[PDB]
Design an enzyme around this catalytic site. Structure first.
Site, PDB file in Angstrom:
ATOM      1  N   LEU A  29       0.931  -1.098  -0.086  1.00 34.58           N
ATOM      2  CA  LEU A  29       0.103  -0.058   0.045  1.00 34.58           C
ATOM      3  C   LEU A  29       0.908   1.209  -0.006  1.00 34.58           C
ATOM      4  O   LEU A  29       0.379   2.462  -0.444  1.00 34.58           O
ATOM      5  CB  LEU A  29      -0.835   0.067   1.290  1.00 34.58           C
ATOM      6  N   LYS A  36       6.822  -1.387   6.113  1.00 32.47           N
ATOM      7  CA  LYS A  36       5.911  -1.255   4.767  1.00 32.47           C
ATOM      8  C   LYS A  36       4.507  -1.733   5.222  1.00 32.47           C
ATOM      9  O   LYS A  36       4.424  -2.306   6.492  1.00 32.47           O
ATOM     10  CB  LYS A  36       6.575  -2.456   3.895  1.00 32.47           C
ATOM     11  N   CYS A  99      -9.153  -1.073   7.145  1.00 29.23           N
ATOM     12  CA  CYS A  99      -8.999  -0.352   5.864  1.00 29.23           C
ATOM     13  C   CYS A  99      -9.506   0.850   5.637  1.00 29.23           C
ATOM     14  O   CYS A  99     -10.611   1.231   6.184  1.00 29.23           O
ATOM     15  CB  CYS A  99      -9.535  -1.406   4.825  1.00 29.23           C
ATOM     16  N   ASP A 142       4.164  13.656  13.005  1.00 30.69           N
ATOM     17  CA  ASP A 142       4.338  13.399  11.634  1.00 30.69           C
ATOM     18  C   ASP A 142       2.870  13.701  10.953  1.00 30.69           C
ATOM     19  O   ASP A 142       2.425  12.974  10.071  1.00 30.69           O
ATOM     20  CB  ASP A 142       4.812  12.073  11.401  1.00 30.69           C
TER      21      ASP A 142
END
EC number: 2.7.11.1
Length: 290
Positions: A29, A36, A99, A142
């Site tokens: 993704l 990752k 998701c 972030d």
């Protein structure tokens, strides 16, 4: 009378191989901080999930805990499960997340237009995750447009903050805050972030950029350090001084002069996001031309 509703379960890490419970496709993704993010499928229910693979280590065990706590807030990607398995000899943390197929905050905006009370409404959802985190003493560090992903493509999908890879813990009725705990200014830059997102939400482009053609503070780094930006036309033409003053107070170079998340939330513009001018912005347009 007890605040039972404030009692939430801790996070039990599963040791069984994650491959027992999900099919882990080899499709990426994207790359989050320190790991990752693959797409995996639930073998029992066939639902789709996101999976961040972290290598087990102190920072890793910090991200999971922090992210677990932050998860209680509806505007932060939910953690379904955390696995501690053995990937190719190495120990790693597998974070199963819900998701988010809604796409980036700005992709949605780009695909259309966007009014200002809309932008206000958005700025307030984001502020909600930020507010929750600072109240439990976490600075995300972030926060950026790209880490804000929408749940579905529905009109009422909800925006959620992702990636806790740089998250950080920050630590009488008349005792001053400075005495109940030091706490530096790591919260402070979440607020700077809020500033940059808001700016872009009203005109389609960012306040700091690269410009060697300039005379002073060519470099974008320099422009940011100085704090060199502005609200050109026509993008900002009908944007209220009220709004611009709010960005002025989030984007201040001096951490400590910056507005706190409680001030932000209590600001009238975010607070009365339903009395705010539904004046049109060039965001959508500007965004498409890039």
């Amino acid at each position: 009378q007890f605040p039972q509703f404030h009692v939430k379960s801790g996070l039990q890490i599963k040791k069984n191989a994650i491959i027992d419970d999900y099919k882990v496709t080899s499709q990426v993704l994207g790359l989050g901080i320190n790991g990752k993010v693959l797409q995996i499928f639930n073998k029992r229910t066939q639902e789709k999930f996101a999976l961040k693979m972290l290598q087990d280590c102190p920072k890793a065990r910090r991200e999971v805990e922090l992210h677990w706590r932050a998860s209680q807030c509806p505007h932060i990607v939910r953690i379904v499960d955390v696995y501690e398995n053995l990937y190719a000899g190495r120990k790693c943390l597998l974070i199963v997340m819900e998701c988010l197929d809604g796409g980036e905050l700005f992709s949605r905006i780009q695909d259309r237009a966007f009014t200002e009370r809309e932008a206000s409404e958005i700025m307030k959802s984001i502020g909600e995750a930020i507010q929750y985190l600072h109240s439990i003493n976490i600075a995300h560090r972030d926060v950026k447009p790209e880490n804000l992903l929408y749940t579905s493509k529905r009109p009422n999908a909800i925006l959620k903050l992702t990636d806790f890879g740089f998250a950080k813990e920050t630590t009488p009725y008349y005792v001053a805050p400075e005495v109940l705990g030091p706490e530096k200014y790591d919260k402070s830059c979440d607020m700077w972030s809020l500033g940059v997102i808001m700016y872009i939400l009203l005109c389609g482009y960012p306040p700091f950029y690269s410009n060697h053609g300039l005379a002073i503070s060519p470099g974008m780094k320099t422009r940011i350090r100085m704090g060199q930006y502005e609200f050109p036309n026509p993008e900002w033409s009908e944007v209220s001084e009220e709004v611009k003053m709010l960005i002025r107070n989030l984007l201040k170079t001096e951490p400590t002069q910056r507005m706190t998340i409680t001030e932000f939330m209590n600001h009238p513009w975010i607070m009365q996001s339903t009395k705010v001018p539904q004046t049109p912005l060039h965001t959508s347009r500007v965004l498409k031309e890039d």
